[PDB]
Unconditional design. Structure first.
Length: 104
């Protein structure tokens, strides 16, 4: 479940995308906590989360949107070690794809 950030002006900010199989999915901003954010930033060697950004701030994505939520405790070294749960009833639009600004 490898992460990446895209559309930022520097590598440690952007829209969140996480790989599953040979495709990448975006993450709805109803579904991504500060602790999930912290694990992602750590995983990419970007320090820790400063901010979550909603409403397709770095632009909306296309394609798949993750159907499970990453229910991270906060100290996991990878998103793949985080517990997982279904997202609430329904699908999101890409207009609600989440982003982050990580900092050291």
């Amino acid at each position: 479940r490898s992460p990446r950030l895209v559309g930022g002006d520097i590598p440690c900010s952007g829209r969140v995308e996480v790989q599953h199989g040979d495709t990448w999915g975006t993450v709805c901003d109803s579904d991504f906590s500060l602790e999930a954010a912290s694990v992602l930033c750590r995983e990419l060697q970007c320090g820790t989360v400063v901010s979550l950004l909603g409403g397709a701030h770095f632009g909306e994505g296309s394609g798949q949107i993750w159907a499970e939520e990453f229910q991270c405790e906060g100290h996991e070294s990878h998103l793949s070690l985080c517990p997982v749960a279904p997202r609430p009833d329904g699908t999101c639009s890409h207009s609600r794809d989440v982003g982050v600004v990580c900092s050291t």
